Design a protein around this ligand. Structure first.
Ligand code: NFU
Ligand code: SF4
Ligand code: SF4
Ligand code: SF4
Ligand code: FES
Ligand SMILES: [Fe+3]
Lengths: 297, 138, 447
């Protein structure tokens, strides 16, 4: 089975996670036929007849778009590998700014930059596309593995299923399931919203109930909830469940609903918006490009 | 030439009733809004609001029972907490806070709904069209 | 005539090398282009400063730990808070494990294919799958080094890729005694493999000299690295700079970096061209990571590493400028980091409970710096009274080796190419070998 991989506007994390299979990577490579992979081999061109493709990253520049279109024609099955390819990822945040702003900062206004001419690289480099777009927005995607990056075992499971001829199935529940933190039997109730530095969290109680914006509730399980287990809220790196299109919108809905529920009729509704100074960066960290409103006008 | 595209969300027991009251009484208002029925204002959440904007909405309206008159007792308190965050989130997304409007209209408040529809249209008409769909299709 | 090596392979990120010729058939222009940019420095604006260690790791999947800590240190300087000693040792233990994982990765999966098969035509052989067929032991040992390295990060950092424990005031979770014991038992096996890796490197670099490739892309330049009382240190210290003769030109606290470093811009690449502000674009060219760090260092912080370094100094001297000898240096650092993991685990403070410190009032400026596997990494953040990022600047390791890479590739073509026919598959690969020697993380470098 000829499998091929490539990367776009990502960080390479998904590929590193593929390598995080360790001993099993060799076992996997004896079952598949790796025909193209820029990080491991020198095969420059995407070959014809590719059964499965693992495309990492979203569409950040013009070359990314070409490659997506090229791999889509050469591959029978295309897989949006990771959160950046599936939902847009962290780079997506750049959608809050124009490309001109993004480029002027990196090549002009930076304190250590010395550009007297005031030029932006344009020779031999591709132009940036209007906004970071998930892979599904430019090409037909057959399957996807969510996670920033997806855990190794999950990547094996998906690839393994395709090799067997079966259809890959992703976990459907939200993170609280895997999460070991104790939940109140009466239900969730939030009193005050605290920033990650405000306070000393209790290691046993649910972080959302303690007043910290934990995205586990609006995030697909699979990762094993390492963030709350380590003492920090989930940032929603895996993205939403199959029944949720926009993760941030849903995360807010939930957060607002339970805020001051024990004083539901008389709690001030202006406490929450005044408390959260940066809303987009709190709920659309890894999914802004896949949101209904994925840019700032 | 250009006429705003507004979408409405109305609770079955109060605003949808108020909307019906305005119709019976022949209380004329602008033909921009297209109302969607829900049983409670609590059924409305950020996703439906953002979805509307993505689709091309120049305005989004949400109606419900007055605070304390919810047919379902406390559904509108949850929506009230949601809409306050949303208002500011829309600003962060470059969408004017004024393009989203939420009111509490009862089943018989047909005169209030008529006037709320007149005002909101005048506000969205002044603001001009929302260029989100224009930029996404690019 | 115009040839292009796109994409450059066995390097993190997108890059290409262009080789042009004039009408007479003579070598005209040889450039190194980086065709990717995401612009983190701008989108970080408006975000919460305490969230920087969540976004910056997403700059690169290989050295995410380095960005997590770098930001953490910066955030700790935004709020005037000094983290407890236990949190310093933990963060460091995390940083050392990541290096082991990084160095092992580059050397075995990205560099070794060329160092083992320098004169091969079969592209399907010049990779880890090809090495594993004739030498499975070499790849299994490499995998074990990474498995061990990432394990350390997963335990301390919380996640092997993109850790989340470095918070405001220190760490979110303390290392348990059971975890420490298991890690300490495994640490000895990591040191064994790192010693074996150096021996493998010796073998392979001899094969490189046997084909006269040890001098590819050679050029003399300054060198930068972090040192603590002159001793080699990747976590804390001051940034020392030595010239091509070895004399210490500078020594400063990372907070003053804007007075020593400057970044130039050329129209053919998204990667900038830095240099020593005072010396200038031509006189101020410098290099970072592996060798550069060994060059500026008086001695290594660990004993087993020091021995190999002393033997290396007697054989090549200080400062060494050979790009290909960055692979060797990388293996010395691989051992030193593996040794530091054991050293830090033995310290009883690592399992302490005083891991966090309440943050103080918000101070507008915040600079955090650490030596990432690929070079000096600086995270500089400016915020408002609430702690919202207003302006950011990132000087990421590999950007500091861009001029060296642009010059190096040019010197390879000058040595092997005289006409378009000379640019054969093996010759063109030599140019990528120069690039590879520096262990470039292109996504990292452009950010
Ligand atoms: N090591 C490393 Fe990064 Ni992928 C680079 N170059 C960071 O500082
Ligand atoms: S997804 Fe998370 S991990 Fe996979 S690439 Fe985009 S960022 Fe690096
Ligand atoms: S922490 Fe985030 S995830 Fe673990 S429980 Fe409380 S909410 Fe669900
Ligand atoms: S927890 Fe939230 S954040 Fe930490 S990994 Fe699982 S999903 Fe990504
Ligand atoms: S029923 Fe209309 S407000 Fe709940
Ligand atoms: Fe930069």
């Amino acid at each position: 089975v000829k499998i091929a991989t490539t990367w776009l506007g990502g960080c390479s994390g998904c590929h590193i996670s593929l390598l995080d299979l360790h001993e099993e990577l060799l076992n996997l490579l004896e079952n598949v036929e790796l025909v193209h992979c820029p990080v491991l081999m020198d095969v420059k061109e995407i070959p014809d007849e590719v059964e499965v493709a693992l495309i990492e990253g979203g569409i950040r520049n013009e070359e990314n778009l070409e490659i997506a279109k090229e791999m889509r024609e050469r591959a029978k099955i295309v897989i949006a590998f990771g959160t950046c390819a599936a939902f847009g990822g962290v780079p997506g945040l750049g959608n809050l700014y124009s490309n001109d702003e993004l480029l002027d900062k990196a090549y002009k206004t930076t304190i250590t930059t010395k550009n007297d001419d005031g030029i932006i690289p344009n020779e031999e480099v591709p132009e940036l596309v209007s906004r970071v777009k998930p892979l599904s927005e430019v090409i037909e995607v057959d399957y996807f593995i969510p996670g920033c990056p997806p855990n190794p075992e999950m990547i094996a499971e998906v690839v393994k299923a395709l090799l067997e001829g079966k259809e890959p199935e992703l976990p459907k529940k939200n993170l609280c399931e895997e999460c070991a933190r104790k939940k109140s039997e009466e239900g969730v109730a939030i009193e005050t919203i605290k920033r990650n530095y405000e306070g000393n969290p209790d290691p046993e109680k649910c972080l959302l109930e303690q007043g910290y914006i934990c995205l586990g509730i609006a995030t697909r399980e699979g990762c094993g909830a390492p963030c709350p287990s380590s003492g920090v809220p989930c940032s929603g790196c895996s993205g939403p469940t199959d029944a949720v299109v926009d993760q941030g919108a849903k995360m807010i809905s939930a957060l607002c609903s339970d805020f001051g529920i024990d004083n539901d009729r008389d709690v001030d509704p202006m406490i929450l918006p005044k408390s959260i100074k940066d809303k987009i960066g709190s709920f659309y960290k890894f999914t802004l490009p896949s949101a209904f409103v994925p840019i700032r006008l | 030439e250009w006429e705003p595209k507004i979408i409405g969300f109305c609770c079955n027991w109060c605003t949808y009733g108020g909307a019906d009251t305005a119709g019976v009484g022949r209380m004329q208002y602008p033909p921009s809004i297209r109302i969607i029925r829900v049983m409670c204002s609590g059924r409305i959440e950020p996703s439906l609001i953002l979805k509307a904007f993505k689709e091309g909405a120049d305005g989004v309206f949400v109606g419900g029972c007055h605070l304390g008159d919810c047919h379902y007792d406390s559904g509108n308190y949850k929506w009230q907490r949601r809409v306050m965050m949303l208002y500011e989130l829309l600003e962060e997304l470059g969408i004017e806070k004024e393009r989203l409007n939420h009111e509490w209209i009862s089943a018989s408040e047909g005169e209030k709904f008529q006037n709320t529809m007149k005002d909101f249209y005048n506000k969205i008409e002044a603001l001009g069209p929302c260029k989100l769909k224009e930029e996404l299709d690019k | 005539v115009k040839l292009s090596v796109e994409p450059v392979t066995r390097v993190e990120g997108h890059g290409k090398i262009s080789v042009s010729f004039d009408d007479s058939g003579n070598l005209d222009k040889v450039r190194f282009h980086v065709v990717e940019v995401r612009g983190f420095e701008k989108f970080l604006e408006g975000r919460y400063v305490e969230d920087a260690p969540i976004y910056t790791p997403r700059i690169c999947g290989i050295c995410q730990v380095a960005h997590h800590l770098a930001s953490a240190k910066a955030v700790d300087n935004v709020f005037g808070v000094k983290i407890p000693e236990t949190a310093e040792l933990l963060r460091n233990l995390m940083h050392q494990g990541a290096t082991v994982h990084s160095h092992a990765l580059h050397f075995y999966m990205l560099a070794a294919p060329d160092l083992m098969f320098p004169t091969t035509d079969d592209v399907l052989k010049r990779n880890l799958m090809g090495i594993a067929k004739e030498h499975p032991e070499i790849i299994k040992d490499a995998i074990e080094l990474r498995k061990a390295g990432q394990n350390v990060v997963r335990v301390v950092g919380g996640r092997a890729i993109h850790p989340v424990t470095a918070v405001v005031g220190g760490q979110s979770k303390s290392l348990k005694e059971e975890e420490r014991d298991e890690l300490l038992k495994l640490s000895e096996r990591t040191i064994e493999l790192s010693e074996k890796s150096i021996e493998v490197g010796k073998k392979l670099l001899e094969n490189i000299k046997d084909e006269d490739l040890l001098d590819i892309g050679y050029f003399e330049s300054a060198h930068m690295g972090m040192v603590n009382n002159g001793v080699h240190d990747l976590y804390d210290g001051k940034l020392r700079v030595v010239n091509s003769e070895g004399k210490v030109e500078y020594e400063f606290d990372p907070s003053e970096y804007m007075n020593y470093i400057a970044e130039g811009v050329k129209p053919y690449s998204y990667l900038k061209f830095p240099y020593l502000k005072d010396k200038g674009e031509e006189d101020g060219i410098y290099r970072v990571n592996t060798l550069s760090r060994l060059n500026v260092s008086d001695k290594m912080a660990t004993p087993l590493a020091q021995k190999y370094y002393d033997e290396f100094v007697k054989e090549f001297g200080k400062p060494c400028h050979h790009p290909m000898l960055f692979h060797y240096a990388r293996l010395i650092e691989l051992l030193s980091s593996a040794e530091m993991v054991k050293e830090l685990l033995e310290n009883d403070k690592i399992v302490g409970e005083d891991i966090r410190a309440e943050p103080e009032e918000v101070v507008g400026d915040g600079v955090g710096c650490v030596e990432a596997p690929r070079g000096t990494l600086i995270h500089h953040f400016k915020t408002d009274d609430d702690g919202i990022i207003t302006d950011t600047n990132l000087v990421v390791a590999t950007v500091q080796n861009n001029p060296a890479m642009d010059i190096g590739v040019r010197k390879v073509a000058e040595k092997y190419i005289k006409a378009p026919e000379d640019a054969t598959p093996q010759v063109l690969n030599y140019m990528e070998m120069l690039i590879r020697a520096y262990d470039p993380c292109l996504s990292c470098a452009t950010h």
